[PDB]
Design a protein around this ligand. Structure first.
Ligand SMILES: *[C@@H]1O[C@H](CO[C@@H]2O[C@@H](C)[C@@H](O)[C@@H](O)[C@@H]2O)[C@@H](O[C@@H]2O[C@H](CO)[C@@H](O[C@@H]3O[C@H](CO)[C@@H](O)[C@H](O)[C@@H]3O)[C@H](O)[C@H]2NC(C)=O)[C@H](O)[C@H]1NC(C)=O
Ligand SMILES: *[C@@H]1O[C@H](CO)[C@@H](O[C@@H]2O[C@H](CO)[C@@H](O[C@@H]3O[C@H](CO)[C@@H](O)[C@H](O)[C@@H]3O)[C@H](O)[C@H]2NC(C)=O)[C@H](O)[C@H]1NC(C)=O
Ligand SMILES: *[C@@H]1O[C@H](CO)[C@@H](O)[C@H](O)[C@H]1NC(C)=O
Lengths: 218, 223, 98
């Protein structure tokens, strides 16, 4: 997150960090005690057995007893298209269930087909880079963004910070976009580099996949 | 080398193994001794520091016959064009003269403007890969046929027969490959060519710098 | 802190050099990182500059991963997925410009 601010500790208890050995590589969202949701492109090329799902984290650079670490038991996708970045969504089943507490909680999803109009105010978040080639975050960051339709596609939810070279950056793939308490996006791609200040960021539209998600997790 | 055979150890005592480093990465090339103080190779093997090994057969073993000498100057041809790969020739001035013996010995260069008729069988040698999947620890070699120039002229936009050689029968799976860059083309025990470029598939023909076209620059540079 | 085998092909032609890119393994890297490394050796080794790439019909590289997966990344595109991955997992990188 470029141009954001630090989130309050465990302000967003559905926020997930996907990690390899070398550290955080993508964000995700806890959608059930044993399921998280992320971008399909985050895991397309990784060794899934080596992925660790970290719940209840805040400062990735410190040891946190609030954390609960899981492995991936199974992958679910629905028509991912890496050439056109359509349906850029993946559900990872955990090898166990989280224990739900103040620091680890399930997110609320919109109803199927709900479409956000331009001007809706949202919050992006994640542990991605703080500048367009700078270092990844230690403390989870959050950013006020606005839904825009101009320079977007109908197949995405796009967001912009007017007049500011701010937005998601490397390591924010997979992280939720929270609008009105609901997860409406999954960070999917940027245009013109991170924080162009010209082109909005693009999120996988969660509401378009809600029936498929419910197929999986219930 | 693709489709060739392992060289008799120390049968090509001029062969040089080059380890090139730059801030951007590392490269491995071949070369050949032309005087006790000079190794010839390709300009596209240039880098900030070059370590030269003479007298090697197995480059993965520290053989007693080896001599390790850094390059004091790495002199690309002043008109080398790395896009067209023209004038792809470079002289390495060694930081000390080699100790001449049965295992380390210079190779002769052709005479002024000496050509090479199509059909002539020549040999290229090197420590490059033998396929997409397999390397080599020891020196290998393969015989290749010189082609008429039309073979390279039709597929390489920038091929210049006045400064380059068209080498390799397209029907034979025989070629220099990754790591052979800079190695010599030997005809009658004279280094006529320097491994330069080819198609990325490794399918023949390939292009060699024609050593004899650069003898004035070579002599001027070595003096 | 890690060297990755790589090749360049321009209109199908390459030099038969055994070459490795230095790429950091101190942290996870991105495709924007690799774009910069790839464009740098396109310029230094084959005289292919940023502006040359605007005019190229195609300009891409493929990242071959050790697990058998590959990722093609066009150089003429400024669309990036904001993910990270480990340099230690890359097997080789083939660059191709036409
Ligand atoms: C930046 O974004 C924050 C948070 O955005 C809100 O929460 C996210 C989790 C998503 O659900 C977004 O869709 C949603 O917009 C904004 O903070 C919010 O500000 C509003 C208005 O100031 C607050 O509403 C008020 O709440 C007080 C009590 O605290 C009431 O008395 C008022 O009557 C009024 O309802 C809201 O509480 C607050 N939400 C949170 C979670 O802090 C923020 O305004 C926004 N800033 C900018 C400049 O865009
Ligand atoms: C699901 O996967 C997670 C992620 O690895 C597991 O968490 C791990 O749990 C073990 C205890 O079972 C922790 O101890 C370690 O066990 C291994 C043997 O598997 C042992 O070799 C180590 O020396 C260590 O003691 C481990 O620290 C913990 N991993 C993390 C990152 O905290 C979890 O157990 C799995 N759940 C199920 C139900 O299988
Ligand atoms: C030159 O030799 C030294 C001494 O062993 C070695 O450290 C270095 O890596 C070599 N240089 C290159 C460019 O390989």
């Amino acid at each position: 997150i470029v141009g954001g601010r630090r989130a309050r500790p465990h302000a967003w208890p559905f926020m997930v960090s996907l990690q390899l050995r070398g550290g955080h590589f993508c964000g995700a969202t806890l959608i059930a005690p044993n399921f998280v949701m992320s971008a399909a492109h985050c895991v397309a090329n990784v060794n899934v057995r080596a992925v660790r799902v970290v719940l209840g984290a805040h400062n990735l650079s410190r040891r946190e007893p609030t954390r609960q670490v899981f492995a991936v038991q199974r992958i679910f996708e629905n028509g991912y298209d890496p050439v056109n970045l359509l349906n850029d969504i993946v559900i990872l089943q955990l090898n166990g269930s989280a224990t739900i507490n103040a620091n680890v909680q399930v997110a609320q999803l919109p109803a199927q087909g709900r479409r956000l109009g331009n001007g809706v105010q949202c919050l992006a978040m994640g542990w991605g880079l703080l500048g367009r080639n700078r270092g990844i975050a230690s403390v989870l960051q959050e950013l006020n963004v606005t839904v825009v339709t101009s320079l977007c596609r109908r197949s995405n939810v796009c967001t912009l910070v007017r007049g500011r070279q701010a937005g998601v950056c490397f390591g924010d793939s997979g992280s939720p976009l929270v609008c009105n308490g609901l997860i409406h996006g999954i960070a999917s791609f940027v245009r013109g580099g991170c924080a162009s200040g010209l082109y909005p960021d693009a999120f996988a539209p969660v509401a378009q996949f809600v029936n498929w998600i419910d197929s999986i997790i219930q | 080398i693709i489709g060739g055979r392992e060289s008799r150890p120390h049968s090509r005592p001029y062969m040089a193994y080059l380890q090139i480093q730059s801030p951007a990465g590392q490269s491995r090339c071949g070369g050949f001794l032309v005087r006790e103080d000079f190794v010839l190779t390709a300009a596209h093997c240039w880098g900030s520091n070059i370590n030269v090994t003479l007298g090697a057969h197995n480059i993965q073993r520290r053989e007693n016959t080896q001599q390790h000498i850094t390059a004091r100057r790495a002199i690309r041809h002043p008109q080398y064009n790395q896009r067209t790969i023209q004038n792809d020739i470079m002289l390495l001035q060694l930081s000390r003269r080699v100790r001449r013996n049965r295992n380390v010995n210079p190779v002769a260069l052709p005479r002024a403007q000496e050509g090479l008729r199509p059909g002539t069988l020549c040999t290229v040698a090197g420590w490059g890969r033998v396929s997409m999947r397999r390397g080599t620890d020891t020196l290998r070699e393969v015989q290749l046929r010189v082609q008429r120039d039309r073979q390279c002229l039709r597929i390489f936009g920038s091929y210049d027969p006045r400064r380059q050689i068209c080498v390799g029968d397209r029907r034979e799976r025989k070629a220099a490959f990754k790591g052979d860059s800079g190695g010599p083309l030997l005809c009658n025990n004279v280094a006529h060519g320097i491994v330069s470029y080819g198609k990325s598939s490794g399918v023949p023909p390939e292009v060699f710098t024609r050593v004899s076209s650069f003898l004035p620059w070579i002599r001027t540079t070595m003096r | 802190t890690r060297y990755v085998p790589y090749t360049i092909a321009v209109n199908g032609t390459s030099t038969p050099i055994l070459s490795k890119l230095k790429i950091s393994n101190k942290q996870l890297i991105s495709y924007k990182y690799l774009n910069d490394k790839v464009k740098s050796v396109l310029k230094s080794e084959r005289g292919i500059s940023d502006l040359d790439l605007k005019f190229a019909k195609q300009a891409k590289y493929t990242v071959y991963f050790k697990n058998g997966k590959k990722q093609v990344v066009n150089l003429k595109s400024d669309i990036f997925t904001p993910n990270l991955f480990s340099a230690k997992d890359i097997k080789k990188i083939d660059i191709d410009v036409k």
